[PDB]
């Protein structure tokens, strides 16, 4: 019945999006309860970009110097504070659109939906995944700093990301809602770059299982292999090595389809060692590593929120 | 700065979604003002799937026999009517979430976002395009009939599609909000199938222009060609033939990049006649035909709503 990349409905999250302007820089922030969260480098100026020191900028900042906008409505600020690398300003106006929310930190390989917004107005929503080098291959333009990626579980919203900068290589770096950076990055213009990227294995295995579910079975083989062999193959073809947790997590899909994991390992090894022979899987001629097993289960079972 | 497939924020549309139940069949509908629109085959039963006649069923239908669910809230229905192939039930409760809306009919090649819903609750959003055979390659499971695809223009929402059935071939068919079917399809369980499909040229050209904008210009050539030659090669490789409107519409992108359309036509002909030589463009090894020029302009210029 098809298999398409879909993101969570960005209905509750967009209601808490606000705009903040300080001096000459303008971007967007999140408005939960009566505290607004924004990137810390909004107090930084063009001159401060060579070497910024944030404690002096924070102590020298006053309440009136900061302008906060919710669409056309400007609120009032009665206090300010800083937490790690994220500024949280005490705003006297509580947000009636605040949903039930949780703050979580995600490990590499987990997928989340990002609501891209410019100048405090939403523009679009799409899915993305955390690369092993702690980067995301998203689509952001200038002035888009402050967009937040989120996950939805029934009623609770889990926020996991917040855009901060764009690397010279064309990838993006961000921090969690508590101010901790994702990977070895700092908010400065020194020699900042990411490491070597490796394609994930669990995501491509889940994608293959979804393809088998949808009716594509031409790549199935009749062989069985060990686990050290697949670990060596993954490390040899630039893939993250497989573990016992990664072979247990595929239990639901394997039971649903009836095909063992080692057979899929052999099939994937034969696909890598021989290409796709010109055929395409789910309309793609290359392996996709942006489908976690949970996404495959949810889309193929119609779980709704 | 990246290039991803993103859909419109489903915040205003999500609040207008409601659920209906009649007899044994249950699905979801749209609630605008104080009239609800639902697919017309809800009044059919298991026996009616061989040869249904709707006039008698509407004659015998009463107000109390129809159950409407707005989340947990049940409304009141005062009267019923049908327009073409869509049921319009007069509900005495006006929808406070009704936005500024327009009803439009789209031609093949235009893209829109679909808010998939199950049992009256949203599930996800994704982009899709109207194929020349009047079908869409979406991801819908059983009981998802009634989801509506929409477009957003600043403040006005344009609704263009509504899911009705799943073809045996694995594609979907739907009707506009007025009730006219998209292509030769009837809401009956008989011999129904689509025609031959072809890849749309303008979407591929827009995708190539976006790739050139992002900095991937390894396929650029130094040749010029006529327009009849491109028409011949498009019809030769099963592409929709190009026109003068399709060469004028690419004016903005071509002026922005400074690359003539005929040069891109020659590059595309040489790509099709020789493959991609193992290289990839924007992370895909196959040509993409789901990016209209408007989408390319909007994403590369950061137009927000």
Curated annotation (Swiss-Prot), chains A, B:
There is a cross-link at residues 5, 90 (Glycyl lysine isopeptide (Lys-Gly) (interchain with G-Cter in ubiquitin)). 3CL-PRO exists as monomer and homodimer. Only the homodimer shows catalytic activity. Interacts with host FBXO22; this interaction promotes the proteasomal degradation of nsp5. The active site is at 41 (for 3cl-pro activity), 145 (nucleophile). Residues 1-305 form the Peptidase C30 domain. The gene is rep. This is 3C-like proteinase nsp5. Cleaves the C-terminus of replicase polyprotein at 11 sites. Recognizes substrates containing the core sequence [ILMVF]-Q-|-[SGACN]. Cleaves and inactivates human TRMT1, preventing tRNA guanine(26)-dimethylation of tRNAs. May cleave human NLRP1 in lung epithelial cells, thereby activating the NLRP1 inflammasome pathway. May cleave human GSDMD, triggering alternative GSDME-mediated epithelial cell death upon activation of the NLRP1 inflammasome, which may enhance the release interleukins 1B, 6, 16 and 18. Also able to bind an ADP-ribose-1''-phosphate (ADRP). The chain holds residues 3264 to 3568 of 7096 of the full protein. It catalyses: TSAVLQ-|-SGFRK-NH2 and SGVTFQ-|-GKFKK the two peptides corresponding to the two self-cleavage sites of the SARS 3C-like proteinase are the two most reactive peptide substrates. The enzyme exhibits a strong preference for substrates containing Gln at P1 position and Leu at P2 position. It is found in: Host cytoplasm; Host Golgi apparatus; Host nucleus. Residues 1-305 are cytoplasmic. Inhibited by pyridone-containing alpha-ketoamides compounds 13a and 13b. In turn, alpha-ketoamide 13b (tert-butyl (1-((S)-1-(((S)-4-(benzylamino)-3,4-dioxo-1-((S)-2-oxopyrrolidin-3-yl)butan-2-yl)amino)-3-cyclopropyl-1-oxopropan-2-yl)-2-oxo-1,2-dihydropyridin-3-yl)carbamate) inhibits SARS-CoV-2 replication in human lung cells. Inhibited ex vivo by michael acceptor inhibitor N3. Inhibited ex vivo by compound 11a and 11b. It comes from the Viruses.
